[PDB]
Amino acid sequence: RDEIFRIAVETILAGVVITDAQLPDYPIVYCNPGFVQLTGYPSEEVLGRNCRFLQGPATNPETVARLRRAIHEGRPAHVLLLNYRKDGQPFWNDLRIAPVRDVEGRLTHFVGIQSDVSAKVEGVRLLEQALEEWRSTVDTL
Amino acid sequence: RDEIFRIAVETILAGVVITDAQLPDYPIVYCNPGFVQLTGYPSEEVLGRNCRFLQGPATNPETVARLRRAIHEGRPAHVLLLNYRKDGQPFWNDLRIAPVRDVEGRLTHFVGIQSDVSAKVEGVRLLEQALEEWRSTVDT
Amino acid sequence: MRDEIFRIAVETILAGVVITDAQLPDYPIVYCNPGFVQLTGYPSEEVLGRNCRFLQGPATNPETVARLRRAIHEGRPAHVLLLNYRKDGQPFWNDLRIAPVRDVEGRLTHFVGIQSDVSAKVEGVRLLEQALEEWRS
Amino acid sequence: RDEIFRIAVETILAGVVITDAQLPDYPIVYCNPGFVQLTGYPSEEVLGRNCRFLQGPATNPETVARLRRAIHEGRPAHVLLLNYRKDGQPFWNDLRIAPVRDVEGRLTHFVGIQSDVSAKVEGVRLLEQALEEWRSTV
């Protein structure tokens, strides 16, 4: 059974991580190949580290703060956060986190699903830029 | 360190299913909540069935056949396919399958990951159509 | 030539061009270029000697017509986006700019209006806004 | 009257020029205030020059050549061309030219209509760029 759920995660293209919520600083104890391709970091450089290493220059500190609180309160969270690949390229990370609890209700882990939506959001920005330039002229008219 | 993967799959929004390659006609033995939302079918109405119940008259037979061949040859595949929700609502399904083999190298299951990319397909079509409209404001 | 050249210039404008007589009652159209004929679908016979309001229809924004009328009576220029209708009853968005025409004594004699169908650009916007619905949710 | 057309041309925001097809190098004999505002050149720096002075490094040679042909063949033409204002600021010129013949059928002038369509173009460019992006996704 379990073998097959692992292989399901291994098959997913989105980044999947599991962090240990009973160790200090919620270290990554698993990542899938999709996380390697998404971030540019091999697993050897991922395991045992907090995910915050993905953050960079323009990452929004408010979003990081909202994420921090969710985790410390053992709650799910779904944010869009600016992250950076190992090569320094920025990417927009549609990030979802969910707590894992055992039969006693003890928080043991977090799961995290990371999806690159750079292309999608970049297309919005350009479309909205073209469209704002138009509606501004219709405002004068 | 086994149920943690299950939970990870449970939280995946994209549809995830597992079919049993040993049982006849590859019955679905698992689907996450993501699949229930995608298809409109509660898991109780999904389990035990072949995924072809998502197909309908407008599904491209060439895509289906190509997929059938990959599965009979125990190979991975990736296809864009028209599916139907329980309510008949059509959608574009970005379907990727992967074989699962035990340590003996026997094929025991397929993993299926389905994403509704309807909005993405429409987005391109709409943006292309808009482009033409705007290009029409300038002769040449 | 001299006068005639400018005539061919005005005829070269693909954009609709009308000259209205600002002395005659009801500011009638005295001239319209071929571009205006193509835009509206009205031949020059069915245009010349009519007020341009014949282009307006059920959904035409009364506010826009009001701002447009004000400037005219005040011999001032104006630029508006207005819904008009073609002879075949087809609606179109009219990017309309009008300018007053004064003689050597500075007396308002005519108006000059330039019409451009921007229906395509509006349509494109509609298509983009529709494509953004998905993301916006 | 036909004196109307002239004063009308003087109001239009769009550029209007007349060139003499008989004189050497098709000089501009007339430009409206719109042409002055569009190009940023006072009419004294316009009249008696060929319109090519608006062209610059990024101007497409194929378009220029296509235009040159039509002018020598005494035909109409309609092109979209990159021009430069006096300040060195580029703009997209929708250029519509027509030949003016006399009663003999002899070519005497050209009428030029210049419209700044930069915004329209820049709109198309942003969409094309957005489409590259959204295509990646699929």
Ligand SMILES: Cc1cc2nc3c(=O)[nH]c(=O)nc-3n(C[C@H](O)[C@H](O)[C@H](O)COP(=O)(O)O)c2cc1C
């Ligand atoms: C399962 C999981 C996955 C995470 N994935 C990411 C991620 O991909 N990118 C990111 O910037 N932060 C991610 N985080 C959040 C950070 O690891 C961290 O909790 C956050 O930056 C709080 O900052 P601080 O604790 O250093 O103040 C993830 C957290 C968890 C629990």
Ligand SMILES: Cc1cc2nc3c(=O)[nH]c(=O)nc-3n(C[C@H](O)[C@H](O)[C@H](O)COP(=O)(O)O)c2cc1C
């Ligand atoms: C794991 C897995 C997931 C599948 N998911 C879908 C799906 O979401 N939609 C679909 O139309 N077919 C899906 N299929 C394909 C059908 O189950 C079936 O294999 C296909 O139609 C083969 O052709 P046949 O129906 O003629 O045998 C999936 C197959 C597997 C093994």
Ligand SMILES: Cc1cc2nc3c(=O)[nH]c(=O)nc-3n(C[C@H](O)[C@H](O)[C@H](O)COP(=O)(O)O)c2cc1C
């Ligand atoms: C030069 C000129 C061009 C005009 N072109 C248009 C036009 O293309 N479409 C339109 O609906 N109204 C146009 N108008 C406005 C109408 O002719 C009219 O002045 C306006 O609707 C004023 O309100 P009324 O029609 O109720 O008097 C134009 C006016 C002028 C002076």
Ligand SMILES: Cc1cc2nc3c(=O)[nH]c(=O)nc-3n(C[C@H](O)[C@H](O)[C@H](O)COP(=O)(O)O)c2cc1C
């Ligand atoms: C009426 C008229 C208007 C023109 N307006 C422009 C213009 O606005 N911008 C431009 O770059 N060229 C314009 N041209 C083109 C040039 O004047 C010239 O014909 C062309 O560049 C020929 O190539 P040459 O420069 O190698 O002689 C115009 C030509 C005519 C006849």
